[model samples]
Target: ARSTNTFNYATYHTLDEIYDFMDLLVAEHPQLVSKLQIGRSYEGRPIYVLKFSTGGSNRPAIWIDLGIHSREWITQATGVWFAKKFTEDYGQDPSFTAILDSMDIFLEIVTNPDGFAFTHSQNRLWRKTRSVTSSSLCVGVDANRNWDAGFGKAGASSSPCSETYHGKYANSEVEVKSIVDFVKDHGNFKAFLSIHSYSQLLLYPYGYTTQSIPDKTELNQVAKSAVAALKSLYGTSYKYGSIITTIYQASGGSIDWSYNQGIKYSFTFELRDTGRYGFLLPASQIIPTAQETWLGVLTIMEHTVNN
Candidate 1:
């Protein structure tokens, strides 16, 4: 199909299909959306981010990336819905319109494209990037744990074959580096959200350390309001707190890096079911999951706009 109207947002799609869908969306709404190739993945695939803006020179932006762990199919599905939703809501939804009028949205739907493709073709449970190392037989690194913040510390693995293996060094994975370069170059991002799944939690920064974030009080309240807004939609319950307290001490996490760089609204969402289906979440729940998630994200974005 030549249009997003004919695209299936409720089901899982392959990397190419999502890439093509990005083009169709830009084609349909050129004034509001555009495709940007930030960098190439380890396997030489073009990593793209869909840019949504109303008009401004480097406007303060919101960063929302999904499928960083490619096995989480729902995050990518939700991202597709989100791309279309941005177009649909711009002029029609007042609050969303007000947001675009002031801030740009940078949506990277396939953060780990190689692993996403690998999940479709070879393994259904792959969670790392497809970058090879010289000394080990293991074929990938946990891209989520490859950032520059307290890298290779407690929560990550040192063995090459382990699932949560932090790479040889910080920003070792090109997939993670691509994002780091772009966000740092952009320099005016107000909020950074990295989307993941299977835990039904909303988390704030400093997963690498036990110390509290300076904006803890305000962030905790914002997360509370976001969770409440999300719950109002489908009554899907979500727990919200700092990452280390709510979840575990995860090192080199994207939000932690974002927070350290002064993007105070940084957050990570572990969306949907609390592990019944695990990463194999059903397609039937995609729209509802995305719908409720939109509320939570919007709440945060509104807060970003005001403060």
Candidate 2:
């Protein structure tokens, strides 16, 4: 059973628990409630997007996403933690209060719900949405690789058996379709940040190859400053660069898709511990990790909004 103590931190939660928490949060803070049915996952799980905007429908919006890969449980937890902090400090922290006052923040907490549930039930390492295809019984598709920008191309496997298999076709997984539809509908999004974990890196776009994006210099500078702020808070190092240069070549990623959609300030943040504890990140690290990441995110938000 999940504890309801106000100070108790959440380590892991079931799908039902997550939904209940979402409902409770919205109910508790009705003023910030902005939930929408974006689309359904491959297995028909409803994908919802929550927006926390202070006021003014015409405010510039920022998009934040988490839980694209099912096994990276920390990403999902971090997203919830962020929402909690925003609510808790809405009035007390001027920075957060100002952010809420000015910008519309759209958060997609769980992008691949079907695979996230599968991870807890069947395989703890499951990372893709279930999507059966001919020639193999792999039965899962890398939703991250199913975006339309570069679609089923380099760095993504065509074989359904591979872990990072791009779907049989572009936007094949319902997870990808949901995100695409949401971004299209919310066309005013100026910046995007997709959270992931187990690798300490802040990555920016054009990840299909080593080729750099036109805004690489500005993006890299902002990412470096954000990482610097994060390190100061946590005293840990983080790699900041283009995704292909820092991590590996990744095609059809959400960050890439955001860039393609004309949101220039898009990033993919891989948070904490470089796989030391892997997906089972200790609950003790949650607060500190969130603290450092919150700093980084704040730095980016401030810079983007002002510049």
Candidate 3:
């Protein structure tokens, strides 16, 4: 029997509840989902990623991760719903079925496990890895800014106490390294997605500088399709483009790293409410947000399958 409790995914969850949900998903859908121990967090908590596939051996894959910045709770909520949705849509939704029939999806729900836990237990606004590499006063490194793709370059901070502080060095955080090593070791992923929150933007490569990615036009078109699909349900508007132009110059980003490795469909999704509520988005909107966000993700996956 499945020991995990039935979860109410309409609202936010504690760290344990979300982790338990992963176990519950695998237990319930053993054929389609498996739990992976990527690495341990700064506090030694298990950092798990869920691999969802219909049937394949080392298949072409889509990589997605959330909760890298802990306070962006909606992304994790969307991750949980996405896990359940994958289980639901594999056989039921023809488009998703066709995509999963050929590709694997690796979803890392809590990318920064230590900061996520800290958000629940200590601070509700923690936004980095709970690493003590800081100046003894600041305790975490911005995992999003700790990647190798333009480390310590413009758009990231050098001061350890700053919220946007890039790490002491690239891949310094184990959480970032684990995903990097796994993806690099496998070396066959077609698409890489980094999910964040409270911006309502769907962005592609080159967050570190003004230079645009090679596949800008194609990516822009796909982003348009995805934005259209997402807005069809909730009338939510989203801007799409290179990260540097649409958002800002952001160095040491995961998508930039993945794109540099030749993953053609690299994207960063900043999901839900523009700024009204900011990080404190309401629980009632959880399901709706996930539902629409899934459309955006699906649009990209479909495009990946064809390309």
Candidate 4:
């Protein structure tokens, strides 16, 4: 039922449908949106990211990635909604208009396509890449835990079978490395957001250790405001703090890696329905979650534009 002109943003979709939606969006909004092929997955599936800008060349931008964990379907669902929302809000929403007028947005809706497809066709709980480990039977490394930030640290596992395995080495997975190289090479991203799900948490840097970031006060305050913005619509409460202190020590995470690279507004958002539905969040909640999450995301974007 997905014709480019009539794709549904309020529901979950298959990988091909979403991929098709990207081209549909670009072809229609050629002046505002474009699709960028960043890399290929282990299974040779094309990886794409949507770029939204009012025509800028290497301008300061925001980096947002979703569904890197594969089974976190909500992030991908919300990401698809976010993409459509960008096109609709450009000239309508005052705040979003300001942000896009000054900066660009790079949104990678599905960062782990091979694993994401595996989640649909094989395991519903899969959370890693579909790469084969050498000299082992285990498949896939936790792509979120394969970044260079504090790689092989206490927060991650070395066992190939573990869900939190850090991988054979930092950036060993092509999915993780491609994003890293893109951000590093572009060098204009001011904020980096890695979206996850089911914890209702908004976290900041230094997840590998208890060390406080120098911008702790500023980042913490921003998280507080962002969570507040998110809750205004549905009253969905969220806890905000440093990852190590609030949740647990989680190394090699994308947000932490981004923070270490001096991307000042790096953060991770673990979204909706704290635990009841967990990763199996009902499809019906997709729209409401995306609506509120949009508020929170915009709060960050607005702040980035001014700062």
Q: Per-residue CA lDDT of candidate 4, range 1-307, in tens?
A: 4444477766788898889888888988899999999999999999899999998688899999999999999999999989988999899988888889999999999999998999889999999999997778999999988999899999999999998888999999999999999999999999999999989999998889888999999999899999999999999999999999998998999988999899999999999877898999988999999999999989988888899
What is the lDDT ranking, best to worst? 1, 4, 3, 2
Task: Indicate which candidate wins on TM-score.
Answer: 1
**lDDT at 268 for candidate 1?**
95
Residues 223-255, model 3: lDDT tens digits: 999999999998999999999988789999999
lDDT of each: 0.94, 0.83, 0.91, 0.92
Clashes of 1: 0
Where does candidate 4 stray beyond 4 Å? 1-5
Per lDDT, the best of the predicted structures is 1
Q: Residue 189 of candidate 3: its Cα lDDT?
A: 98
TM-score of 3: 0.97
Model 1 bad stretches (over 4 Å) = none
TM-score-sorted candidate list, best first: 1, 4, 3, 2
The CA-based lDDT of model 2 is what? 0.83
